[PDB]
Design a protein around this ligand. Sequence first.
Ligand SMILES: O=C1C[C@@H](c2ccc(O)cc2)Oc2cc(O)cc(O)c21
Length: 212
Amino acid sequence: SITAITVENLEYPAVVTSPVTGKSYFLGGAGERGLTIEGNFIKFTAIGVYLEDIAVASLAAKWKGKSSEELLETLDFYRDIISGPFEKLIRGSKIRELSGPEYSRKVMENCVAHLKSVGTYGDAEAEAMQKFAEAFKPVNFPPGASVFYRQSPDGILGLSFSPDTSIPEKEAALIENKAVSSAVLETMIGEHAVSPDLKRCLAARLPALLNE
Ligand SMILES: O=C1C[C@@H](c2ccc(O)cc2)Oc2cc(O)cc(O)c21
């Protein structure tokens, strides 16, 4: 009973398979991100977080039997999701047109803040973030265009860009850095991620799967 989610006409299939790793994932949750301008929420993109199918078995031990309300208030739960021994696939699909530099600027800002926050922002991470930036420079995201973050548990962040919502066959870059690899997802569902839409989806959707 793992359904699909549609955000501003941008649909997120309940399941997807990576053309890069062959692994299959289930939709953990989908929401929206944008900017608050003059007290008004201006939507810029849709975001969906996919978890490798094996995430269920991994999370089962500690979080089966827990209620959605309980999971939602438990930071540890989200930590297991963020740093769990399974691949996470994040798909951002634009609502409003953003260039690669424009979009990446905010993402990188949050990633850097997180990294410095937890004391893991050294030269290696800075270089990884520059490589991150470089990968986005030649890209533009018109409405519907997407960015795919493949978070490998092996400490690598794969970056893919699509003209639309379809997963590209090949990745544009590989950011090989452990800290940075989870930084993106951390800024989406981590403790210091204000927006709760993705967290709420995860808390609401996981219990059913964890129970069976
Ligand atoms: O999906 C987005 C939107 C992005 C963004 C919003 C508005 C804008 O004008 C440019 C970029 O900021 C982010 C920053 C993050 O840490 C994680 C995210 O998932 C995102």
